[PDB]
Amino acid sequence: GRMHAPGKGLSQSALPYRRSVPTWLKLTSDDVKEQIYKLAKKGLTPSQIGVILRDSHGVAQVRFVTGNKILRILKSKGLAPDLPEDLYHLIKKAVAVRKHLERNRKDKDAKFRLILIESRIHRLARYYKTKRVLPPNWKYESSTASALV
Amino acid sequence: SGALDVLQMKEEDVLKFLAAGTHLGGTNLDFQMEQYIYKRKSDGIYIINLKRTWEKLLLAARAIVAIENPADVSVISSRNTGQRAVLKFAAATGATPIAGRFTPGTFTNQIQAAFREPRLLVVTDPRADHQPLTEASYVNLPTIALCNTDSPLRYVDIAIPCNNKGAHSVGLMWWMLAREVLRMRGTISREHPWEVMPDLYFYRDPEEIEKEE
Amino acid sequence: VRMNVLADALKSINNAEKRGKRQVLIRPCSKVIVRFLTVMMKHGYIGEFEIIDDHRAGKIVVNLTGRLNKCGVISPRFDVQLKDLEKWQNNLLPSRQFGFIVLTTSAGIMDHEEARRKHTGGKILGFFF
Amino acid sequence: MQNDAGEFVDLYVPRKCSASNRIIGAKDHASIQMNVAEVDKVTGRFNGQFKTYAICGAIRRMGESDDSILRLAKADGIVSKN
Amino acid sequence: IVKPNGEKPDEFESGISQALLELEMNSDLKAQLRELNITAAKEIEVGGGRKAIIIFVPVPQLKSFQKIQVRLVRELEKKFSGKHVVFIAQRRILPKPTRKSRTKNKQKRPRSRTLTAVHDAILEDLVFPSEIVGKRIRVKLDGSRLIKVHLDKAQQNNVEHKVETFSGVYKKLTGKDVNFEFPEFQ
Amino acid sequence: PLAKDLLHPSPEEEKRKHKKKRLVQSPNSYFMDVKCPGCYKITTVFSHAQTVVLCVGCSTVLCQPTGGKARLTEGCSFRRKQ
RNA sequence: UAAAGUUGCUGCAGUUAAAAAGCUCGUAGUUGGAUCUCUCUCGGCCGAAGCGUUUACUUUGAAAAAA
Numbered sequence A: 001g002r003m004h005a006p007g008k009g010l011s012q013s014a015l016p017y018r019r020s021v022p023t024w025l026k027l028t029s030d031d032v033k034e035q036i037y038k039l040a041k042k043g044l045t046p047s048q049i050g051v052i053l054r055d056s057h058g059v060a061q062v063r064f065v066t067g068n069k070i071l072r073i074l075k076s077k078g079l080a081p082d083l084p085e086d087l088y089h090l091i092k093k094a095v096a097v098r099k100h101l102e103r104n105r106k107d108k109d110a111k112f113r114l115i116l117i118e119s120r121i122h123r124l125a126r127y128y129k130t131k132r133v134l135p136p137n138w139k140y141e142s143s144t145a146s147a148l149v
Numbered sequence B: 001s002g003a004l005d006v007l008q009m010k011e012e013d014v015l016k017f018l019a020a021g022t023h024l025g026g027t028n029l030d031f032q033m034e035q036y037i038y039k040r041k042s043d044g045i046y047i048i049n050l051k052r053t054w055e056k057l058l059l060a061a062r063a064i065v066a067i068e069n070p071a072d073v074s075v076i077s078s079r080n081t082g083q084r085a086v087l088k089f090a091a092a093t094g095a096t097p098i099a100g101r102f103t104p105g106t107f108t109n110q111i112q113a114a115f116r117e118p119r120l121l122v123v124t125d126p127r128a129d130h131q132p133l134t135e136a137s138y139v140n141l142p143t144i145a146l147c148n149t150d151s152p153l154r155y156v157d158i159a160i161p162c163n164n165k166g167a168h169s170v171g172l173m174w175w176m177l178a179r180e181v182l183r184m185r186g187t188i189s190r191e192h193p194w195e196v197m198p199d200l201y202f203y204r205d206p207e208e209i210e211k212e213e
Numbered sequence C: 001v002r003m004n005v006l007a008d009a010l011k012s013i014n015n016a017e018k019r020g021k022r023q024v025l026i027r028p029c030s031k032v033i034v035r036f037l038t039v040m041m042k043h044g045y046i047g048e049f050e051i052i053d054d055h056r057a058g059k060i061v062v063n064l065t066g067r068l069n070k071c072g073v074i075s076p077r078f079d080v081q082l083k084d085l086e087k088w089q090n091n092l093l094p095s096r097q098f099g100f101i102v103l104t105t106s107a108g109i110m111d112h113e114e115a116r117r118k119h120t121g122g123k124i125l126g127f128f129f
Numbered sequence D: 001m002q003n004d005a006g007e008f009v010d011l012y013v014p015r016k017c018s019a020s021n022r023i024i025g026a027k028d029h030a031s032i033q034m035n036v037a038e039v040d041k042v043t044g045r046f047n048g049q050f051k052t053y054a055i056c057g058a059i060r061r062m063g064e065s066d067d068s069i070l071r072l073a074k075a076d077g078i079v080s081k082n
Numbered sequence E: 001i002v003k004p005n006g007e008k009p010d011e012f013e014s015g016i017s018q019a020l021l022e023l024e025m026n027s028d029l030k031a032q033l034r035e036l037n038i039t040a041a042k043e044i045e046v047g048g049g050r051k052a053i054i055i056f057v058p059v060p061q062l063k064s065f066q067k068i069q070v071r072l073v074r075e076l077e078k079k080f081s082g083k084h085v086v087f088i089a090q091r092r093i094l095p096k097p098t099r100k101s102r103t104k105n106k107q108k109r110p111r112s113r114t115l116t117a118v119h120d121a122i123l124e125d126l127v128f129p130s131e132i133v134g135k136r137i138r139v140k141l142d143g144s145r146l147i148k149v150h151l152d153k154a155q156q157n158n159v160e161h162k163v164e165t166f167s168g169v170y171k172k173l174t175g176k177d178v179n180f181e182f183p184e185f186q
Numbered sequence F: 001p002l003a004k005d006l007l008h009p010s011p012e013e014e015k016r017k018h019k020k021k022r023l024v025q026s027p028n029s030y031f032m033d034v035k036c037p038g039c040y041k042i043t044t045v046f047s048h049a050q051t052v053v054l055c056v057g058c059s060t061v062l063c064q065p066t067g068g069k070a071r072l073t074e075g076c077s078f079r080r081k082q
Numbered sequence G: 001u002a003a004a005g006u007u008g009c010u011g012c013a014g015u016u017a018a019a020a021a022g023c024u025c026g027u028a029g030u031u032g033g034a035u036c037u038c039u040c041u042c043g044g045c046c047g048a049a050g051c052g053u054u055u056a057c058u059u060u061g062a063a064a065a066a067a
Helices: A029-041 A046-056 A062-066 A070-077 A085-102 A108-130 A142-147 B009-019 B050-066 B083-093 B129-133 B168-187 B205-210 C005-018 C031-042 C085-092 C110-119 D058-060 D065-074 E010-023 E057-067 E069-079 E114-127 E153-162 E168-172 F011-014
Strands: B037-040 B046-048 B073-077 B095-101 B120-123 B142-149 B156-163 C023-026 C049-052 C061-063 C072-075 C101-105 C108-110 C122-128 D034-038 D045-055 E040-047 E050-058 E083-090 E133-138 E145-151 E178-181 F031-035 F044-046 F061-064 F077-081
Touching: A029 A046, A029 A062, A029 C023, A046 A062, A046 A070, A046 B205, A046 F044, A062 A070, A085 A108, A085 A142, B009 B050, B046 B050, B046 B129, B050 B142, B050 B156, B050 B168, B050 D034, B050 D045, B050 D065, B050 F031, B073 B083, B073 E145, B073 E153, B083 B095, B083 B168, B120 B129, B120 F031, B142 B168, B156 D065, C005 C023, C005 C031, C005 C072, C005 C122, C031 C049, C031 C061, C031 C101, C031 C108, C031 C122, C049 F061, C101 C110, C122 E153, D045 D065, D058 D065, E010 E040, E010 E050, E010 E069, E040 E083, E040 E168, E050 E057, E050 E168, E057 E069, E057 E083, E069 E083, E083 E114, E114 E168, E145 E153, E168 E178
Parallel strands: B073 B095, B073 B120, B120 B142, B142 B156, E050 E083, E145 E178
Antiparallel strands: B037 B046, C023 C061, C049 C061, C049 E133, C072 C122, C101 C108, C101 C122, D034 D045, E040 E050, E133 E145, F031 F044, F031 F077
16 A cells, blocks of 8 residues: 555556567667657656657657666766656655745644655655665755755 | 257257247346356346256256156245146156245154155245255255346256246246156157147236136 | 565465365465475375466466365474474474475475485475365 | 275265365265266167266355356266357 | 687588578678678477477677568578578576685676576577567476467467477477467457 | 366456456557648557647647546547557 | 463464554664576696685584583
């Protein structure tokens, strides 16, 4: 179930058994990489890049075509964000709820949700510091959270 | 049947089945009767696959024939729809009939006047003949039942998928069971039609008997 | 969360045998699960099984011969020495005539009789009888 | 059931269910032993021989005695394949 | 022109090299065969008295070989009478590191060079035109595995004859028994 | 049931199940080639596309995102592959 | 001390008999999914030399007073 909710959902993608490039894909690996670079230059996260490639151009999985994941490709050329995208979005949500709570001090549900969001941020940041994705002294603070977003 | 050409179902049997409405079940489906139905119509009625019906009827006929003493086969019908059919089956085959109320303890109470110990047990409806079916689980008594789409299969060892609601279908089903039992025994052959017509087993309500005469 | 996939596999097999089923679907599969099933099958308790290959973690469909009374896991996997094996068999097995304790030893995964034949102690995985 | 001398020492050998391969107990009065008549291949008449399927009371109670007997007859050629 | 790995080409390997040379100088695929190359070639009995030949192509040229393999295999088949032709990449297997060993390699063994991965790649490369749509490892009562491979239905009549030679080649290379099937369900 | 085969399920019974609960999981989605009157090139569109797809040859939207499958506009021919 | 499976590791119990914290985060603790099969010296089977990634196991072999 969810880490911070009582829900137990089964919604997630079901990757097909075949790991091959589809027959309809006339796009070679290098064109896919170039489109990935262009989409990243437009200011899009790897999730958005994958969504656009799956939706408009038609790419079942970038890994099955280019052999590398989108974030790995971005890091290889060097276009990746300094901090990971999921951590960045969690920090963004924390900043949003903290800004809301300033003018809504009576919103005691917002305070609880902010506590849950910051717990998620701390867990993810600890994991990233374990794998050296973040500097060992990387700390999240309320007064500095909007400085990272 | 055993895939034998001799035991295959003929066109006349299918004509009788369709005329009696045997293939037409109910709107409900027991999860143990799913293997016997074919599809569900646009009006919710489940169609009973007549291949499976013929297969189960022949299996039941084999089971009845395997009972050496015909009197050791008991045929039960609490509903009036199958009562006359049960008496006709018993007369033709030699089984012992119980038409009407089944007295509890008939199979389990040895100190009782109407105490019998059959070797086989055939009922018209498991839901309506639930008392003999329950008592058959006390005396090691195997059970054959005529089961609709919503019939429960507890204590039913050979369920013949058929419409057990309509009088025509019940009479035809009992008549075909008797005919197949006789053919498997040896008395009466299968090269020419049986002299007894299915309508001898059909239930006639008082309105019908008054109108006919 | 799901830890000890062997416990789930053995519980599923036990539950399907209690219900009287002829086949059980086990997922996820693992090397230890396959070895335990092979030890079970060499002794005639479980019969043939097939490993379905999905590209992440296999599933196994196991035919069920009605010969199995109980299969269980031992958690945690206690390290068992050859001198403590008899106590484990007295604790776990219905009798000294039938029933096996499956150990994992450096010589592989095998039952307690083979482990005594090869003069190896190991870690207790489970049992079946 | 067999000692080291090879002599059989059981009181009796109980029946096993033809569906579940479980022992049928001596006091399982819901269990059945059904005989299904065998038939000539060209006349379709009783051969004097039959086939026996023993179903325990647990299967009867749960309602799968019918399906078990159907599968046993199918796997024996008494009931036509498909 | 073949680049052998054992430093001494065989007569059959040189024969296959001559066939590829002839296809290079005069055929319908002379433009692409220039940079293409093979590394080994063997012939084995796949059953009864039938034979099939295995061509070991270097891995970086495997995709280039495959994009013309459908054309190439027909010519190699008409050239070598009734001997089936397969193209399997030259994949090396590094042994599993053990605590009893020496300085074999300062870095970790790649996962593409393990035995299971190489065998899966060999099975994939054995059937190039037909993809693998499923796999079922059957364990028989004696504890002997039997792998059953599901292939595309859209490549059924074209490749069904090549079976019983896929199994023989896989048994020769990997030692594992494999069967091939074409499931009706897509 | 008590004897339902899990190794060889019916194809309808496998399309019935949840995509994750199948014997081998497989998506319920697909890719389509959608032709527009205002263009000629190939526009492969995901069936469950989350983006607004625009035909480069006109001012006409190809599909609109929806909670499930994308809504294809009337007047576009889509062919499903695989 | 056993009886005491009435201290329960083996091996208890917690709806109503005694009992699950009002609820949720959370650090330590405990637990944790699949997946890897002229390197070397006297005579064309030998002591030396081993960073095999240290280990945990398991099985040996010494050393572990007598009573």
